Structures are given as C-alpha cells and as structure tokens.
C-alpha cells in the first residue's frame, strides 16, 4: 500500500515515561525470541500443531543516546536494587492511502535482560546505549 509515516522512529512509552531521545539507526528492535506454534510430525502422516506458551515473549532493544535523560531513565532502572517491571507501548502514527491511522504495539511485563555494552572510542565514537528489555507479551494491533 501507500504508507507515509511521521516521526520516523515509533514513540515508545514505558512506565509513563516516553522516550524522547533515541539513537540514530536501529533505535527500537522488537525481536520475538521464540517460534509461535511448534508442530510435530507423526509416523502415519498427520501433524500436531500447538501454540508455544512462549509465543508472545519479545525483546525490545532500545538504542538511547549515551547520556540523554532516556539513558538516565533506563540506567536508573538497570541500577535498581530489585528488577523493575516495564509495561508500555510502541505507538506509530502513519497514513494509509491518505487516511491518518495509528499502529499500537503494547508491551507487557518486561525487564532489562542484556545490559548495554559501553564503549568510548577515539577514532570513531559510538555514543549509544542498547538496553534490551524482554516483555512477556507484546501485542500489535491496527
């Protein structure tokens, strides 16, 4: 179709704090970690189709600016004495065939899994922090 976005990277909200500072590039990467439906093949020939209970668990990878308040928020979450639960949404406003529309991806029950790999380079600095949160259930709709 004819799809024209606005605000190139989708607006991410967690715990009522919306990320106003994303790195250039792969700012948000919502990878589903497990296959949706696992299937098994029988001797006679039939197949047993069965939804994985892990079917929804996603990892949202976030590239925030090296020290911008978004990095402060995610770093404070990382440094908490007990793991903090994130429950937010990725909202993207776009137009289809000229009609304004919104796509909503709710993220439920996440925590920081893989901590950012902090690098300070001289020849070519990489001023990014990649926090990977693993939400229990992410549902997209539109």
């Amino acid at each position: 179709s004819v799809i024209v976005y606005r605000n190139n990277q989708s607006t991410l909200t967690l715990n009522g704090y919306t990320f106003q500072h994303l790195y250039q590039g792969a700012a948000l990467v919502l990878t589903p970690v497990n296959a949706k439906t696992a299937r098994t093949n029988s001797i006679n020939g039939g197949v047993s189709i069965s939804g994985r209970v892990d079917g929804g668990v996603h990892t949202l990878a976030i590239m925030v600016q090296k020290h911008s308040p978004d990095d402060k928020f995610l770093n404070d979450a990382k440094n908490s004495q007990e793991p903090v639960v994130f429950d937010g949404s990725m909202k993207r406003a776009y137009t289809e065939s000229g009609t304004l529309k919104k796509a909503t991806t709710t993220l439920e029950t996440g925590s920081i899994t893989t901590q950012p790999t902090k690098t300070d380079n001289n020849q070519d600095p990489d001023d990014s922090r990649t926090y990977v949160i693993e939400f229990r259930n992410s549902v997209e709709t539109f």
Partner: protein, 125 residues
C-alpha cells in the same frame, strides 16, 4: 529340520505384491522370533551356525519411513559328550547309528487317556 539353520527360505519370500518390503522384514523377524529355533547369522568373515535371537528392537523415527532395528543373537554352542563314531549322518542312517536312547519310567497300569478295554480277540484268546 532340513532347513534348520536358515529360516528365510523356509518361511520364504513373501510373494504377495500388497506387502511392502517393511512388511516382509517385520513378518520374517516375527516368524523367526516366534519360531524359537536358532538361526545362522553372518557377520562379515563368519557365518555363525546356531545363533538364537536374543533381542530384536525395531524403531521407527518420525523423520524417516525406514525401520532401524537392533538384533542381538547368542550362539548356542553344544558339544558331544558321548562316543559317536559318525559326526553327522544322513537322515537315512541317523537313527540307525543312534545309540540306545533312554526314556524315564511310567506306570501304564495307571493311565486313563487311553484305557481301551481288552480286545475281544484276547479275552478268550
């Protein structure tokens, strides 16, 4: 007994076009196993003469239509205790050269399954 060692050509090629080859392998293996007679088994370089089927495990994965089977046989080795001049004779003289075989006792006066009366030709005589 003529085909004692080799059961295959006793049972024979299945001969029916309906039964696929795995049919033939399974029904031959079951025939050999229920046969309870020792068979001869050939590992390369040896055709051992009296192997008894000890364990036959056919397995059918759900990713290959074939049958993967493990069969352990155990030799039935048995030597001759008694003086026998002839090692293996024909059937035509096998009983002829046999030594005096022995059966246990029994009380014929106390049998019921065949207690036929005395023949009428004998009571007088």
């Amino acid at each position: 007994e003529r085909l004692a060692g080799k059961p295959y050509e006793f049972f024979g090629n299945s001969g029916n076009s309906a039964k696929t080859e795995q049919e033939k392998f399974i029904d031959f293996m079951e025939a050999l196993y229920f046969s309870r007679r020792p068979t001869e088994v050939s590992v390369n370089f040896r055709d051992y003469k009296n192997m008894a089927l000890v364990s036959f495990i056919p397995v059918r994965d759900n990713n290959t239509k074939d049958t993967r089977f493990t069969a352990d046989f155990q030799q039935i080795n048995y030597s001759t205790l008694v003086y026998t001049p002839v090692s293996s004779p024909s059937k035509s003289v096998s009983g002829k050269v046999s030594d005096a075989s022995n059966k246990g006792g029994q009380n014929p006066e106390s049998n019921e399954t065949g207690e036929r009366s005395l023949l009428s030709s004998l009571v007088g005589g």
